[PDB]
Amino acid sequence: FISIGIGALGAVGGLGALYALVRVMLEPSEIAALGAKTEIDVSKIQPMQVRVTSWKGKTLFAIRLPKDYEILKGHDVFALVGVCTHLGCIPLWKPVFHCPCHGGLYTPYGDVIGGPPPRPLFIPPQKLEGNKLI
Amino acid sequence: FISIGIGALGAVGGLGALYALVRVMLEPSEIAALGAKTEIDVSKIQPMQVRVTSWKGKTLFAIRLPKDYEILKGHDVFALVGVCTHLGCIPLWKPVFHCPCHGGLYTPYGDVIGGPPPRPLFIPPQKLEGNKLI
Amino acid sequence: TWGLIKTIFFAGSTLVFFFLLWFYNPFKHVEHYEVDEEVKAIIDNPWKKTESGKTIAEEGRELFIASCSSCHSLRYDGIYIMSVAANPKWKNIEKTSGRPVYRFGTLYKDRFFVPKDVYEAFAHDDIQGLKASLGQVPPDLSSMYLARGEGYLYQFILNPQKVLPGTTMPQLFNPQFDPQAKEKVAKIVAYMKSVNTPPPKESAKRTVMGVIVIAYFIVMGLLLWKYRENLLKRLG
Amino acid sequence: TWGLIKTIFFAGSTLVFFFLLWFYNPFKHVEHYEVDEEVKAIIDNPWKKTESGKTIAEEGRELFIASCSSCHSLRYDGIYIMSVAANPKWKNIEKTSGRPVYRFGTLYKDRFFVPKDVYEAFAHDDIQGLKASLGQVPPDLSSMYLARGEGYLYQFILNPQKVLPGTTMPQLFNPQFDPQAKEKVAKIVAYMKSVNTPPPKESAKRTVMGVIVIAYFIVMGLLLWKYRENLLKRLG
Amino acid sequence: IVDWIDERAHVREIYRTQMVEYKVAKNLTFPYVFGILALVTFAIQIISGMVLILYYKPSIADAFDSATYSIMGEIPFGWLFRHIHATGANFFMAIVYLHMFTGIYYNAYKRPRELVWIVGWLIYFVLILTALSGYLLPWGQLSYWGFIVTTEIPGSLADAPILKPIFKAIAETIVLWMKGGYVVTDVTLGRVFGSHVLIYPLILLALVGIHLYLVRAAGISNPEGIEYDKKKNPDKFVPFHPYMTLKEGAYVMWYLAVFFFFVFFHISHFLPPENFEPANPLKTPAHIAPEWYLLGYYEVFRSIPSKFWGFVAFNALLLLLLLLPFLDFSPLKSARRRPLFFVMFVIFMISSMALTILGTMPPTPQNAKLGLIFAALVFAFFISLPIISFIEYGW
Amino acid sequence: IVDWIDERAHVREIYRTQMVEYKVAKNLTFPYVFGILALVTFAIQIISGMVLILYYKPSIADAFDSATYSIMGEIPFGWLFRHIHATGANFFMAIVYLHMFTGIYYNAYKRPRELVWIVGWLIYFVLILTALSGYLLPWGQLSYWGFIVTTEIPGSLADAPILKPIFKAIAETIVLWMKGGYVVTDVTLGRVFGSHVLIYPLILLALVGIHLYLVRAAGISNPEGIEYDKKKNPDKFVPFHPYMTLKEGAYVMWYLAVFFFFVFFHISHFLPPENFEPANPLKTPAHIAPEWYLLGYYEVFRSIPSKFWGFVAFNALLLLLLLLPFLDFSPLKSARRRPLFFVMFVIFMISSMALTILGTMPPTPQNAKLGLIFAALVFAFFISLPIISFIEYGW
Ligand SMILES: CCCCCC/C=C/CCCCCCCCCC(=O)O[C@H](COC(=O)CCCCCCCCCCCCCCC)COP(=O)(O)OC[C@@H](O)CO
Ligand SMILES: CCCCCC/C=C/CCCCCCCCCC(=O)O[C@H](COC(=O)CCCCCCCCCCCCCCC)COP(=O)(O)OC[C@@H](O)CO
Ligand SMILES: CCCCCC/C=C\CCCCCCCCCC(=O)O[C@H](COC(=O)CCCCCCCCCCCCCCC)COP(=O)(O)OC[C@@H](O)CO
Ligand SMILES: C/C(=C/CC/C(C)=C/CC/C(C)=C\CC1=CC(=O)c2ccccc2C1=O)CC/C=C(/C)CC/C=C(\C)CCC[C@H](C)CCCC(C)C
Ligand SMILES: C/C(=C/CC/C(C)=C/CC/C(C)=C\CC1=CC(=O)c2ccccc2C1=O)CC/C=C(/C)CC/C=C(\C)CCC[C@H](C)CCCC(C)C
Ligand code: HEC
Ligand code: HEC
Ligand code: HEM
Ligand code: HEM
Ligand code: HEM
Ligand code: HEM
Ligand code: FES
Ligand code: FES
């Protein structure tokens, strides 16, 4: 038929044009997801060594410690978003590791022992499957 | 009066708004004229020495030679837009001075003696008033 | 009448709302810093001439370059770190746009504005001992006057430990044993103010034209009102 | 009839005008360069696999990096000068956007695209012996395939003195005594082509959707025509 | 002359039809001029944005140096057109708020004006997006962070409700829509610039055209509520020109004087000083609540102790302005005519000002108690419209 | 349903008035669809430019890497919307040329359509600027240099005439207008981007609206020349819908098929390959004539051995399209009705195609002889319109 063929075909055309326009404008996909995996081989890092990385943006720390806030008990591996709190610097490693901007100290777990910062370093959500962190 | 006051005053307001809009959009003045003077002290340059400068953009040469195309006879000072011709490089000084991109030679006056370039270096318009070139 | 109460309520509450929403919300208690009033006049007029025919803005500029450009890069006026001196090109700063500073309304062909990405990639992306030692790159003082105010700028400088409790920015001017330090910080802040504030010649034309535009719109509205009122009598 | 002559003239001349204005103007005699046909198949399919499971595009990439990245910086694929190696950061190339190369439609997290101003200010604005010696900076091969064509690229490379009479770009592959040089230049041009041309998987979806859009508009116009013609009989 | 143009365009036949015999009402009160003023401010925004688009550069390393160095110091009269733009944005929100609030007063949403209110609510929604996306463009310290906090709000929907915690990765306006996905990069700033500059003002020109046509097709509602004595009762209409086209002609000039007072002499609050610091994504400012036209909803949000229910309230408070004409069903029209709706409208207007004011203050628990007390009263205005309707339906 | 929207918007009353009882002519030939097609291509350009504005960055070091790297490789379907844009620009010039040329054929500029032709010539002039300024934006090798050579043309006015050599520094469109003054810098590219993207398409939307209104107010001219048998003679009109609204509905689809053939399968001439080299201001390409819609005037120019007189001819050839309705004064209307105007129009159309074709070839002296022979015939069409009018005025 015709009077319904025009409608069906116009709907198909509008759907294709809309798909293209949404795909161009509203789509950062497959380049936005950087990075959900965040490959962090924890078989390389030696104890009491942290790595600079990025999970959902900058930055990310990957601490590894054999023995002894504290949301998580001893797993010997985790990850913490490393940015100083009260003004936003980057603390450098080495038990505590402080940021040289003002003097804020931080335990290897993330809490603050002597605080110019008011709050600790937030635990970003993570996942460990074998020898990989998320 | 009133019915003419509104017209006079609306014309003044439209003229002011138009002046502002033209002054914002269509006006590179006093930063566009860089550079019409192009201060080139020719009391410093020693004979057979050229200077890198800019007249109406890049680039400009300022040659000074005591003795011997040739649009201009002996004035001992002039200026030539220095960019190689057949592909657009910058020849370096030293009687001829060539550009090392393909081997084009140029007399101290501007013409080509052995030409991968077809045409010489153009004489940009200039003005000499005392110890200054334009 | 009841319409009068309706009017002075629906307009009263609206004016009171936009008043304490658009200036002087009395329930926000942000802190204020005052200039020490030992000078308060070095800063009020940075274009005030001094001896040797140099304005306070210029004296503050050279004081900033000499004792403050060691770690801070006030662009918008061509002042970058002195490591190297000067930190931008070295060799050619002109062929990077890179353009000369042309502020209101005069240009300075001796100082150049290099973009934020060309600089700090050619300059500090080989991170010298600024982000390393301090941990904090000394950010940029190009528009820090507009963001802080002369009070905060004067009170921060010469006592950075007062404003922020701990801070690796040094005192660099310690009073109670330096008689000229207050005037030094005053000339520094006067310079930083002269970068973001139009000179008295340009700052007065703005006031004149702002008064004239408002007076133009008021009188044009008033003429339209009188015209309508005179025309409505020809018709009723 | 006279209307028929009017039609086949005002449409004939218009089609003949837009034909020799929009493709094959036979009066412009620009010169053409041909691939030597000794291969002509290394270039037609750069994604053609080879031994060791490496495509011709990849072999050309490493050949370009090894013997051509000495002076040319093919960005859009993360290949900058080898002085220094690699010329971009050194230290951190990631915090300059600086983003990873994400071409159609796969990204390479190992190679980074640095802007034209960050690069060549951090890299070559301390002019090493490239603009100095050659006088000409070796420009950029990122989009030189699209600008020259595989014929011109193959004929320029391996005999730069043929195309341009004098040129300080060296032969760098001299035939008549090198049996593999033609295949080397062929793999180089195949790589440079694989940077600007979508792979066969993506280049075929474009053809399919281009055929389908044209077939959609033709058939939609034809259905509108038939609808109008059937409706005009209900009315006359 | 002009007769030559009349014989070809019929301009005088359009004038004597659209202005001389338009027959507006006579008793139109002052707040009817807010539409004309919103249109004038729209023109101001377009005119001063066509100037800023010449010199603003949508790169992270180039923005805030275009707007603050280039526009303000380098360009002649560029300071003026950035002042005009940042002032017109706030004046354009304020005028549109007054417009819809005492278009609510006169119940200009009832029949036959249901459609003009739908188109007006679309205007309002896309105007929030045009002012919200244009605030990221200066790339200032609190511009960037108010954009972050404003686009992290739909992430609270992905928060687990008490039931059905599947919304994670559902309606992910965080990674899909603005914020570009985990990072605000150069591509995201380019996208926000392009949208704010051309995509939103075009679908505002279209929507304002449709709105202005629907106002004419439905006729402007008079503040009495009787809505007509048409074909009869002269001396009640006194046609548009010049009884109303010079009254608006003067109110527009006075509004422009009030506007150019803020443009020139008091703009320390439209270009806030603390936005003159270049944005760095590692340092968060102290108090980063959104801009004032969204604080009325930001105080409803972050007052419910849960985030998901706070987002649901955020969105129900917006959706109850769309469904407002379908929510109020009564023969009576104005608020002069409904003595019980006037009380609820005073409550609603007071509690909507109070939420916007409480949204500026820091989030103390007493502030949250107040923000709940006032959110309850703002919702009581919408929950009571059908009850008032049932009461008036029986007279 | 839809009746609910009709009672509030009166959409069916607008349909049955604008489409069912519009009463177009019946004998409208095919070239009357060129206006509808120009409007469709305008929509195509706006739609695909709203996409390119998201990712194009108006910086000298960033442009050509947005357009060539970002748009083409990084963005999904970005290749398609750059192909659509560069194809729509050339199709939009071609359609507008056909539109005005056989709107000249049917003499749709005579009374009472003098004003619609003036507005159409304004459309054409601002469209040259929108396509000329949008070509600089890719910042390619020949984009930049064709912009340079095109804006250096008004400098030939500053050239000394044989008399009064005062024009130097007079109408200095070199330093004042585009080219930014002695250098095309980042500020000039920002200015051209802003103008091309928003200032010119807005004053094209305004002008196209005015043009479409003036066409309706004056009525569409029929190709016979009698221009009416109105209030009488049925069976000559057969109203617009659906006799003409589905004929155009099909011609638009077929034109879009021809358009999307070039978009997909043959675009090596709209995005010319030699424009994929980043512009460097030190290397001039070999042949740098402007883009094809300006070659008809570029061949008149640079054919007169003088530059000043060449510029005067360049501008007189444009101005004689504005004054074309005032230049032709006759009762007769169509070219079917004037056997002596048809000959001059064939001469004009042939000699206007021939100039555009000769403008592509390199400037040999024989090419200049031909470009003068054809410029003379193009001017003879305008110099003969008043003579033909005097002849026809006496029948
Ligand atoms: C140099 C400095 C400047 C100097 C001063 C400038 C001039 C100022 C003039 C006043 C401007 C404000 C205008 C107030 C409105 C006029 C008052 C009014 O008219 O009252 C009502 C107006 O309604 C209406 O717009 C309703 C009123 C608007 C509602 C208030 C807006 C609230 C905004 C809140 C925004 C956040 C809320 C959204 C988030 C939930 C209607 O009353 P009526 O029953 O019809 O009777 C009218 C009388 O004349 C009787 O004849
Ligand atoms: C996949 C590949 C695609 C496949 C093919 C696609 C389809 C193509 C179809 C043809 C498209 C071209 C249309 C040609 C116009 C139709 C011909 C025509 O109709 O002829 C005349 C058209 O006028 C007019 O537009 C005048 C004609 C336009 C003039 C020519 C334009 C010149 C352009 C020059 C541009 C540079 C000049 C400017 C610089 C000075 C009018 O003739 P009539 O006397 O009224 O009699 C009409 C007959 O039907 C008799 O009944
Ligand atoms: C610098 C500022 C910008 C300038 C831009 C300029 C643009 C346009 C300028 C031209 C303005 C048009 C003025 C014409 C006024 C109409 C006069 C009129 O009133 O015309 C009427 C009909 O027009 C009608 O329907 C017409 C009504 C139907 C269409 C209404 C428009 C719909 C909404 C459009 C807005 C944008 C839509 C979205 C676009 C994508 C009357 O027609 P009659 O046959 O006699 O009687 C029939 C009965 O209706 C009697 O009432
Ligand atoms: C041509 C066209 C085709 C789109 C084809 C599509 C998406 C195919 C689906 C995707 C396909 C296959 C495969 C998947 C796919 C294809 C790729 O090429 C691709 C490329 C790069 C990365 C990834 C991909 C990818 O994933 C776009 C149309 C042109 C526009 C400008 C769209 C905007 C249109 C609007 C806004 C409405 C305007 C309609 C107007 C009123 C005309 C009415 C007449 C008719 C339309 C009914
Ligand atoms: C406020 C305003 C004032 C302009 C004031 C001017 C230039 C004064 C002249 C310049 C003066 C003193 C001194 C010289 C001068 C002043 C500087 O500030 C300055 C700053 C920096 C460098 C150099 C200078 C300088 O040289 C601009 C108006 C706002 C606009 C957006 C303009 C665009 C307007 C358009 C397009 C028409 C719209 C009209 C509209 C329909 C309303 C109708 C009602 C009424 C207007 C009749
Ligand atoms: C020894 C390094 C150093 C030098 C020299 C230095 N500063 Fe600082 N300054 C810093 C650092 C690091 C910061 C930013 C982080 C911090 O310390 O608070 C800063 C911040 C600032 C701030 C703003 C801080 C804020 O949060 O608003 C100002 C203003 C400032 N400096 C002014 C100056 C002036 C003026 C001088 C020259 C007299 C100067 N600085 C010299 C280290 C320095
Ligand atoms: C010893 C320096 C040098 C090296 C190594 C070099 N080139 Fe060149 N090449 C140049 C220079 C300089 C230019 C540009 C000016 C010129 O010489 O023509 C150039 C230009 C080019 C051009 C384009 C010229 C035009 O006008 O279109 C191409 C293509 C090219 N080179 C490819 C290559 C390839 C492929 C390699 C690696 C096999 C390479 N180049 C290695 C010096 C070099
Ligand atoms: C129509 C309603 C509009 C509103 C409510 C609005 C609002 C805003 C706001 C609040 C800003 C921030 C300015 C600042 O904080 O300094 C802004 C910036 C900007 N606007 Fe708009 N805008 C509107 C329309 C437009 C239009 C039509 C354009 C056309 C180009 C435009 C162009 C810009 C540009 C380029 C900027 C950034 C320049 C700057 O930082 O000042 N805007 N807008
Ligand atoms: C750019 C934004 C807007 C513009 C330019 C605009 C313009 C106008 C104008 C000129 C009128 C004429 C009647 C009058 O002046 O009161 C009007 C009427 C109206 N507007 Fe808007 N408006 C805008 C936004 C809105 C919004 C956001 C709403 C509702 C949420 C709205 C709802 C209405 C209603 C209900 C009327 C009818 C009033 C009545 O007939 O009594 N408008 N609009
Ligand atoms: C209306 C008539 C228009 C014409 C004739 C036109 C013509 C052109 C042309 C020829 C180009 C060069 C593209 C290339 O060579 O690759 C271009 C580029 C461009 N146009 Fe337009 N344009 C028009 C409208 C618009 C509009 C409304 C926009 C709205 C944003 C726009 C945005 C752009 C942008 C951003 C570019 C540069 C992007 C690129 O390099 O492809 N154009 N235009
Ligand atoms: C974006 C550009 C343009 C658009 C969208 C446009 C659109 C239209 C449309 C739809 C018509 C209806 C009648 C018809 O289809 O033939 C028309 C008529 C007309 N146009 Fe345009 N046009 C444009 C440019 C021009 C130009 C550049 C000229 C002249 C230089 C022009 C001159 C005319 C004339 C004379 C008519 C009346 C034809 C007649 O009534 O016989 N138009 N235009
Ligand atoms: S940021 Fe670490 S000390 Fe203030
Ligand atoms: S550029 Fe100097 S030789 Fe070709």
Side-chain angles (χ1 to χ4, degrees), chain B residues 9-10 13-21 23, chain C residues 104-105 202 205-206 209 213 216-217 220, chain E residues 44 47-48 75-77 79-81 84 253 256 260 264:
Chain B
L9 207 63
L15 223 60
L18 180 68
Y19 171 83
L21 276 168
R23 190 88 153 79
Chain C
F104 28 69
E202 165 69 23
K205 288 159 68 172
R206 299 187 177 188
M209 72 185 277
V213 169
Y216 163 91
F217 277 107
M220 178 81 173
Chain E
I44 287 274
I47 289 292
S48 73
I75 304 310
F77 291 120
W79 67 276
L80 178 60
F81 284 93
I84 288 175
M253 298 297 161
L256 284 181
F260 279 105
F264 279 99

Side-chain angles (χ1 to χ4, degrees), chain F residues 121 297 313-324 327 382:
Chain F
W121 182 92
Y297 309 99
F314 187 115
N315 287 137
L317 187 60
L318 275 169
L319 217 67
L320 281 169
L321 289 183
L322 189 54
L323 312 178
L324 204 150
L327 191 60
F382 293 117

Side-chain angles (χ1 to χ4, degrees), chain A residues 16-17 19-21 23, chain D residues 202 209 216, chain F residues 47 76-77 79 81 253 260:
Chain A
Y19 171 83
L21 276 168
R23 190 88 153 79
Chain D
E202 165 69 23
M209 72 185 276
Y216 163 91
Chain F
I47 288 292
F77 291 120
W79 67 276
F81 284 93
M253 298 297 161
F260 279 105

Side-chain angles (χ1 to χ4, degrees), chain E residues 42 45 49 52-53 67 82 85 89 130-131 134-135 137-138 196-197 201, chain F residues 198:
Chain E
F42 194 16
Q45 290 292 272
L52 298 190
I53 193 185
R82 200 186 176 200
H85 215 71
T130 317
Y135 199 49
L137 299 198
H196 163 81
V197 156
Chain F
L198 189 67

Side-chain angles (χ1 to χ4, degrees), chain E residues 198, chain F residues 41-42 45-54 56 64 66-68 71 81-82 85-86 88-90 92-93 127 130-139 143 193 196-198 200-202 204 270-272 275 291 293:
Chain E
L198 189 67
Chain F
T41 315
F42 194 16
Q45 290 292 271
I46 297 185
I47 288 292
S48 73
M50 289 196 319
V51 166
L52 298 190
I53 193 185
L54 307 184
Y56 177 77
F64 184 80
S66 45
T68 297
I71 297 273
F81 284 93
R82 200 186 176 200
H85 215 71
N90 298 255
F92 193 25
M93 287 309 131
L127 205 59
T130 317
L132 199 156
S133 70
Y135 199 49
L136 172 75
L137 298 198
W139 205 254
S143 158
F193 163 81
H196 163 81
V197 156
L198 189 67
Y200 288 146
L202 277 189
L204 273 170
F270 298 136
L271 282 85
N275 203 48
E291 190 64 23
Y293 41 91

Side-chain angles (χ1 to χ4, degrees), chain D residues 34-41 154-155 182:
Chain D
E34 291 70 71
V35 177
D36 267 339
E37 178 46 320
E38 286 270 286
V39 283
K40 199 184 275 286
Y154 180 89
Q155 291 303 130
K182 284 183 174 296

Side-chain angles (χ1 to χ4, degrees), chain E residues 22 28 31-40 42 92 95-97 99-104 106-110 113 116-125 127 204 208 211-212 215-216 218-223 227 248 321:
Chain E
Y22 175 50
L28 297 191
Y32 271 91
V33 77
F34 291 141
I36 324 293
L37 298 193
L39 203 147
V40 159
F42 194 16
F92 193 25
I95 287 297
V96 162
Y97 271 144
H99 185 30
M100 73 175 70
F101 279 170
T102 162
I104 284 175
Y106 300 122
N107 299 315
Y109 50 81
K110 294 178 164 298
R113 292 172 194 87
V116 66
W117 179 269
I118 307 297
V119 177
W121 182 91
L122 289 176
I123 298 270
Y124 168 65
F125 178 66
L127 205 59
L204 273 170
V208 164
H211 189 88
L212 292 171
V215 172
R216 283 288 275 274
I220 177 154
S221 85
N222 77 319
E227 175 65 278
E248 290 160 33
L321 289 183

